[PDB]
């Protein structure tokens, strides 16, 4: 088989910048590689077929390059409709093709530390038997952030779930929501619930927390 | 007189699978011991015939078809197989009585830079009949509007190239292949072993 | 009219079956390699099965034996029969024509296929009470299936509002929360109510959010 990999998983770029995505292959594919673009909730769109051949109906700023195992899509002047995900596909073993993971291109901005808020379970959700604790990371950039949960200074592992929003059209910021789930049993047996947040815009980690009685 | 298998295995230049070469052997003696005495080949299945029990038989005609394909397509040169090569390039009948020989040729068929002399038909409307050979280079028409000799939307050039690179995996390296077909109709059987 | 119009995807439990339909126009499926590609949520493009012009078909190990690609030349439609479904098959399915070295130029609009053994239940709306600026919101928990719309004060609140995409929990039920950042000097005066609407379960829910003490 043939493995396909893309240079930067994520990428921040300004409108009018020259972007360069890279794609690599397990073997010498010799220019049998196509490039696609995909905006959330739409289908793929072909951009460059056979390494550098532009696809009619696609803007002139899309360049295709590379010939053996290392390949490169280039956008000359990124425009507002160019923020999307770009994957590469392989035509070497057609009709069984494999794809790359994709490279998400987003709106470069100034680093913004997130406002950190921690919500304790509502007494209404305690009647039901389970307890959900929520930690919010609000309005930051870039998207990469880490959120560690502590219950009486015991880092939690298999009981959290995260969710990130889309780049805000006004902010160009992200927001995050980690939900720790528990049981009226466990939540009732421990006092201090806490949420450590590390992120490029915070000097050191930020820990929002609370105590059950409170 | 010995059957000229040497000018088929020792051929310096083999052919693209789409235009697979065919030698028709007749009126001679063939030692199938020398072919399978030497273990120079990677693949040698014999269908409907035993190689050691082949020197005692006779056939009115023996056919030596030769071509070069990707190393991982050699499994497609067997009865009732499907794929690009078996479907659109070289088809073995379900009731096949013959042998299939193959050896890796990453020394001669994969040049520094990549070899593009070997094409395979990658676009066809329907499957080859067994031992059919299709050489058409017409623009393949995937649409309901004629192409008329030019590539573009719905218009695909049907032959494509193997990019034979010597540094690639073995599945993607050139294998030379020889398919010995043994036939016998009501006519003098002149191709005998010893 | 170059377009691939699919349909036939929906909600089905495991061991279940479904027939997806790629109606073609602008090309002839019969003389083209036609693949089925699926993309699981936030996952990426994965090939499913093809069908050549000679009628030869081919599938991936996960569906080999459970899926079945075919076509009705007269109607110029391509179909995918999905039998004995599993929960790893929940993804958006795309029908495409592969142009080999020319690329997969014509893609379908996509049809979603959710395979879950879960009784569609309405969500619970628990509140997230606030503690220079304050935040708050609703925890729309344990609903099925997607999706659920959220608004605040029936549309009088849209600034500082954040309604996250849903997660899929361990129980096979979804749970997303919605938050809003308002001035902390409004807690003792402005009324903040969240509007949760699950159509599939015909559930409309409003829930005043306010502090405790
Ligand atoms: C090709 O040449 C070698 C000597 O280099 C000879 O022994 C060999 O048998 C020839 N091929 C065949 C199939 O006889």
Numbering used by the authors:
A (entry chain L): 1 to 214
B (entry chain R): 334 to 527
C (entry chain H): 1 to 131, 138 to 219
Publication excerpt:
The RBD is responsible for interacting with mammalian receptor angiotensin-converting enzyme 2 (ACE2) to mediate the viral infection of host cells. The binding sites of these antibodies to the RBD would completely overlap those of ACE2 and block SARS-CoV-2 receptor binding, thus preventing viral infection.
The RBD residues R403, D420, Y421, L455, Y473, A475, and N487 are most common binding sites for VH3-53/3-66-derived public antibodies that are recognized by almost all members in this class. Besides, the Y489, G502 and Y505 residues in the RBD can also be recognized by most VH3-53/3-66 antibodies. However, they bound differently to the RBD, with KDs from 1.3 nanomoles to 12 picomoles. The other five potent NAbs (i.e., BD-503, BD-508, BD-515, BD-604, and BD-623) belong to the VH3-53/3-66 public antibody class and possess a high degree of identity among their heavy chains. The obvious affinity differences among those germline-based public antibodies may result from their light chains, since their heavy chains had similar epitopes.
